[PDB]
Amino acid sequence: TGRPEWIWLALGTALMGLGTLYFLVKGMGVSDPDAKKFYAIATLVAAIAFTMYLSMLLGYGLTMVPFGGEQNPIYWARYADWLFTTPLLLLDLALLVDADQGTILALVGADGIMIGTGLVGALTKVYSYRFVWWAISTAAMLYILYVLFFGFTSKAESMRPEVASTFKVLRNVTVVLWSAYPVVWLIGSEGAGIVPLNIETLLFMVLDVSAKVGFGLILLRSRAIFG
Ligand SMILES: *C/C=C(C)/C=C/C=C(C)/C=C/C1=C(C)CCCC1(C)C
Ligand SMILES: CCCCCCCCCCCC
């Protein structure tokens, strides 16, 4: 098939198979348990992205959805990816500031809504409805960013300065990265079609890798992961 965006997928596969491995060996070296599970979580988060990017590299998780008179190419392997990785990364932040069970259930439940409506909206055939789904989804995301920015950050201050200090950085990678996502969906292949597909995969690879591997390196690298 040799699609123009395969380059960026072959590239995604490589940066995540490589991140997954670095995490995995470093993780099996640690003896602390509190810190030990920040390592399993990251080995798993990179690993899921990895089988997905590669599988896509290989022509799976791609489907043609009709709308706007075209036969639009929708990569759904992305939502299977995000479905499991986004709630776990939120789990990374919740363990860190000692979240309640209630707040974690809520962040996860809303996260399920983000991706579920994201996917539905990306498989819709009526052009204006795609955008109703994109919108309930984004609203879910703003909600999660709200909690994190207002709730978690009130609570990262019951921690040590090294923990709040670390939470502020990861919290800042999240807010910046997670919010570009709805803007890319919408100007590219799933939304307006302004940005062609090789450039979309290229921007989703950079947010993905930044957000999983850039995130893991910063987290696993801090003193705060030792309870
Ligand atoms: C490793 C992947 C990460 C951190 C993915 C984050 C993904 C999002 C914040 C996705 C958001 C979306 C919307 C706000 C609306 C339209 C559809 C989505 C699912 C692309
Ligand atoms: C828990 C929230 C479930 C929300 C389902 C909303 C469906 C809205 C459909 C609007 C179609 C025009």
The ligand minimizing its distance to the Cα of 216 is 1
Nearest to 205 by CA among 181, 182, 188, 183: 181
The ligand minimizing its distance to the Cα of 113 is 2
Mutate to test the pocket of ligand 2, among 117, 124, 136, 143 (most ligand atoms within 8 A of CB): 136
The SS3 of residue 226 is coil
Say yes or no: CB of residue 117 within 6 Å of ligand 1: no
On the CB side of 2, CA atoms within 13 Å amount to 0
Which approach determined this entry?
Answer: X-ray
User: Residue 179 CA: which ligand 1 atom is closest?
Assistant: 9
Residue with the smallest CA separation from ligand 2 atom 2 is 113
Q: In this structure, are residues 137 and 118 in contact, taking their beta carbons and an 8 Å threshold? A: yes
Tokens of 29: 């070296």
Task: For residue 106, report the distance from its CA to the centre of ligand 2, in Å.
Answer: 18
Show me where the domains of the chain are located.
1-227
Q: How far apart are alpha carbons 186 and 195 in whole angstroms?
A: 9
Please report where in the chains the tokens 């198979």 appear, as a residue.
17
CATH of 1-227, one of 3.40.50.620, 1.20.1260.10, 3.40.630.30, 1.20.1070.10: 1.20.1070.10
Give CA separation, 34 vs 18, 46, 92, 194, 219, in Å: 24, 19, 11, 46, 13
Say yes or no: CB of residue 86 within 6 Å of ligand 1: yes
Nearest to 53 by CA among 22, 5, 3, 16: 16
Say yes or no: CB of residue 174 within 6 Å of ligand 1: no
**Terminal alpha carbon distance of the chain:** 50
* Residue 73, phi then psi, degrees to nearest 5: -80, 105
Number of CB atoms found within 10 A of residue 183's CB: 12
Q: How far apart are alpha carbons 59 and 215 in whole angstroms?
A: 28
Q: In this structure, are residues 61 and 78 in contact, taking their beta carbons and an 8 Å threshold? A: yes
Q: Tell me the β-bridge partners of 63.
A: 74
